[PDB]
Nucleic acid binder design. Structure first.
Ligand SMILES: Nc1ncnc2c1ncn2[C@@H]1O[C@H](COP(=O)(O)OP(=O)(O)O)[C@@H](O)[C@H]1O
Ligand SMILES: [Al+3]
Ligand SMILES: [Cl-]
Ligand SMILES: [Cl-]
Ligand SMILES: [Cl-]
Ligand SMILES: [F-]
Ligand SMILES: [F-]
Ligand SMILES: [F-]
Ligand SMILES: [F-]
Ligand SMILES: [Mg+2]
Length: 454
RNA sequence: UUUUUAA
């Protein structure tokens, strides 16, 4: 395609020969690297090849049709590129299993080559089309397993066909800060039926709609970012609220804003120290830029207990995080195992694979991963760890554990095996004065509400 | 059993 640089922006125009998904031009990494005027995303092209050909050489998607600021161009390119390559990656892996057989002894073995008419899986990997589809779209031999059930990677790919390629100019207020500090409370307190609430997290959506109804008697419908990107916005919007905004790449947020076209402003609420977006290819991310025109910070939690605040303040928030919660009972460590969950406890674990056995172990209880719980408040958390090893989700710096510990406003049980390195920190949280007064919180909050409403 | 997420 053609690439221009009208001062001081970048414009890519696709030509009739070009491979295009919606408004995004599909380019090979080398084509990007040959182009001097695309040098602002050469790090992206290099990162695409380093995680594809070595692990063609992948693809780089670029927004076309509009003069875009360089920073937005970078963000939109990187975000759309990750979606495209993740779909290719998953499908290529499935294609490898179907043609070369599974790699033992991995989870590749849990896939089954089956005839499309003899399976009951709703979605299916079609070996002739080289993509995942509904079972009734496939004819003959198909591969069936967890990545095809459902094929999120295909859903996200199809969403690229409607992804905006030109940022929407509007005020973007960021409210960032520590867990439990009232970022989501702001959305629940200010949302009107003329607004749109989105969330980077699915369970957080239901928490919002329920809390707005219970607290303000107002029926709203919060949607995930993915739901909006994958399904569009078919009504005018005054304020766009994005909760758990740091779970999404900046270019995804730009695409969401241009899809919604809010008439007044955008408010992003989030915490970069909690779970973000992961790339299954673990590509180095270069262009997750700040897109806010104003940024406010919250350092005082209302939810998190003193023992938990002491731990995550020290690990993740440079000791600046405090809490107004007076709960200071010790965290219960169970390696024996001497404990059972009480009614109302949220049962949490870091691994999706362990959720199955825990649901059986604790029928009637809420059970989910730490990552899926992000944004929720619970009276008690019953965390279970089935195995102790060097998995990064349980590392000391893990954002997953950060989220897990900060879900409770009171009791926390950590059920694990002896030798769990986390036991030391849990039974001996860092010392310090991590307590704040309610009015310190109120004056911090007032500064943010003054700026949001200004 | 390495984590988001559509209808
Ligand atoms: N005045 C208040 N404003 C906000 N939250 C409050 C207030 N009083 C008590 N809380 C409690 O603090 C918690 C704040 O959590 P939330 O808004 O979900 O935090 P975040 O979205 O910042 O993680 C809620 O469970 C709420 O019940
Ligand atoms: Al929170
Ligand atoms: Cl950190
Ligand atoms: Cl409190
Ligand atoms: Cl106490
Ligand atoms: F939080
Ligand atoms: F939070
Ligand atoms: F939260
Ligand atoms: F939150
Ligand atoms: Mg929240």
């Amino acid at each position: 395609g053609i690439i221009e640089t009208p001062r001081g922006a970048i414009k890519v125009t696709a030509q009739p020969t070009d491979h295009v998904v919606g408004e995004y031009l599909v380019l090979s990494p080398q084509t990007v690297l040959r182009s001097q005027k695309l040098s602002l995303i050469h790090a992206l092209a290099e990162q695409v090849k380093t995680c594809t050909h070595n692990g063609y050489d992948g693809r780089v998607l670029v927004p076309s049709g509009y003069a875009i600021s360089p920073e937005d161009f970078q963000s939109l390119s990187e975000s759309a590129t990750m979606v495209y390559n993740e779909r290719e990656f998953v499908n290529r892996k499935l294609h490898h299993i179907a043609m070369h057989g599974p790699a033992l002894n991995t989870d590749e073995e849990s896939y089954e080559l089956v005839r499309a008419e003899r399976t009951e899986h709703e979605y299916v990997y079609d070996v002739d089309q080289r993509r995942c589809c509904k079972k009734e779209e496939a004819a003959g031999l198909v591969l069936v397993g967890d990545l095809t059930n459902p094929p999120y990677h295909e859903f996200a790919y199809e969403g690229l066909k409607i992804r905006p390629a030109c940022p929407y100019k509007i005020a973007v207020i960021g409210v960032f800060g520590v867990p439990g500090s009232g970022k989501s409370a702001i959305i629940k307190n200010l949302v009107t039926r003329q607004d749109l609430v989105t969330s980077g997290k699915k369970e957080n959506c239901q928490e919002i709609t329920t809390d707005v109804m219970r607290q303000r008697g107002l029926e709203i419908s919060a949607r995930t970012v993915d739901s909006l990107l994958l399904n569009g916005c078919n009504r005018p919007v005054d304020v766009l609220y994005v909760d758990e905004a740091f779970a999404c790449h900046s270019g995804t947020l730009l695409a969401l804003i241009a899809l919604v076209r809010p008439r007044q402003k955008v408010v992003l609420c989030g915490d970069p120290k909690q779970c973000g977006f992961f790339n299954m290819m673990q590509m180095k991310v270069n262009y997750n830029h700040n897109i806010c025109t104003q940024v406010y910070h919250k350092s005082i939690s209302r939810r998190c207990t003193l023992p938990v605040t002491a731990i995550v303040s020290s690990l993740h928030y440079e000791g600046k995080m405090r809490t107004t919660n007076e709960y200071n009972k010790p965290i219960v460590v169970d390696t024996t195992g001497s404990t059972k969950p009480d009614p109302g406890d949220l049962v949490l674990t870091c691994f999706r694979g362990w959720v199955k056995q825990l649901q059986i172990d604790y029928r009637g209880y809420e059970v989910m991963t730490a990552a899926a719980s992000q944004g929720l408040t619970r009276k008690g958390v019953y965390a279970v760890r089935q195995k102790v090893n060097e998995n990064p989700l349980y590392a000391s710096t893990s954002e997953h554990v950060n989220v897990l510990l900060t879900r409770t406003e009171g009791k926390l049980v950590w059920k694990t095996l002896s030798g769990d390195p986390w036991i030391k920190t849990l039974q001996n949280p860092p010392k310090g004065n991590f307590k704040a007064t309610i009015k310190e919180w109120e004056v911090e909050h007032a500064s943010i509400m003054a700026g949001i409403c200004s």
